Design a protein around this ligand. Structure first.
Ligand code: 6IV
Ligand code: 6IV
Ligand code: ZN
Ligand code: ZN
Length: 257
């Protein structure tokens, strides 16, 4: 009923999810010359030392690594946020070729991929309640460019052969998501939405300025995953990105000059 193909892709999503044409949809193009430096924005606090990864799963739209969010173990605070947001999962969006794959763009530039670390506001008790609130989630977005390998991604890439098709999962304990972060935490921020159905308008977006570099071999492994289930016609999981949506009545703020 929804995907990234011609007949069920982003241009169709509004029929089942009318909020797709809403006032705070994501992703957006980040126009760097219109984003305003906000000296009131605090440094982002990423506290991932006690993260407990659980599983890696092909859900037919991406692959995701899930975390134990039943306690304040891996949390995001600070930056534009009030209160504490627990890490639930990370996943990626990527392209069929290196010149596309990201969801956010920077002055219309598309990156080869984009990493989303999804966190929810503990004031609302569980993620299902958080997605119904305008400040319920915080998603840390990180761009990927192709160049050198990212050592902290290799443990992910090497297990993808075991979750090739929709529905497959595997144990993925003791994975440290700090290994996926760039050096700088300079960021842009704006209020937006989930980028997949149900497209709920519950996200404070925090998009890092500095991309991470991954190797061509690493992204090639992303592109060997399948959207389909085992035994169905093979359709490579590539181009699983929603394009930029209208900014409408929103301001993007920068944490840096
Ligand atoms: O593709 C995307 N770009 S995204 O960052 O906007 C983004 C955000 C999301 N979210 C959806 C939800 C609602 C609960 O669902 C979650 O239920 C948990 C168990 O409680 C997890 O087991 C499970 O992983 C799942 O995520 N929260 N975030 C999904 C896709 C995307
Ligand atoms: O003194 C200040 N420092 S400030 O930068 O914090 C600041 C911000 C503001 N505003 C922020 C907004 C919400 C976004 O709407 C904005 O985006 C445009 C394109 O999106 C149009 O919708 C509209 O023209 C608009 O510019 N409205 N006003 C006013 C004064 C000051
Ligand atoms: Zn469906
Ligand atoms: Zn995402």
């Amino acid at each position: 009923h929804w995907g990234y193909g011609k007949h069920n892709g982003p241009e169709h999503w509004h029929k089942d999810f009318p909020i797709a044409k809403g006032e705070r949809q994501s992703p957006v193009d980040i126009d760097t010359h219109t984003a305003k430096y906000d000296p009131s924005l605090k440094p982002l606090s990423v506290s991932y030392d006690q993260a407990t990864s659980l599983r890696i799963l092909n859900n037919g739209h991406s692959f995701q690594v899930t975390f134990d969010d039943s306690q304040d173990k891996a949390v995001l605070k600070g930056g534009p946020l009030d209160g504490t947001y627990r890490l639930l999962q990370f996943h990626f969006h990527w392209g069929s070729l290196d010149g596309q794959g990201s969801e956010h763009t920077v002055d219309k530039k598309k990156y080869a991929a984009e990493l989303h670390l999804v966190h929810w506001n503990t004031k609302y008790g569980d993620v299902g309640k958080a997605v119904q609130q305008p400040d319920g989630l915080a998603v840390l977005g990180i761009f990927l460019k192709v160049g050198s390998a990212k050592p902290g991604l290799q443990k992910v890439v090497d297990v993808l052969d075991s979750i090739k098709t929709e529905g497959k999962s595997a144990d993925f304990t003791n994975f440290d998501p700090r290994g996926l972060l760039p050096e700088s935490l300079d960021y842009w921020t704006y209020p937006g939405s989930l980028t997949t159905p149900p497209l709920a308008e519950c996200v404070t977006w925090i998009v890092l300025k500095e991309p991470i570099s991954v190797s061509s071999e690493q992204v090639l492994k992303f592109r060997k995953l399948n959207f389909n289930g085992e035994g169905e016609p093979e359709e490579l999981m590539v181009d699983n990105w929603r394009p930029a949506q209208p900014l409408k009545n929103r301001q993007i703020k920068a944490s840096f000059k």
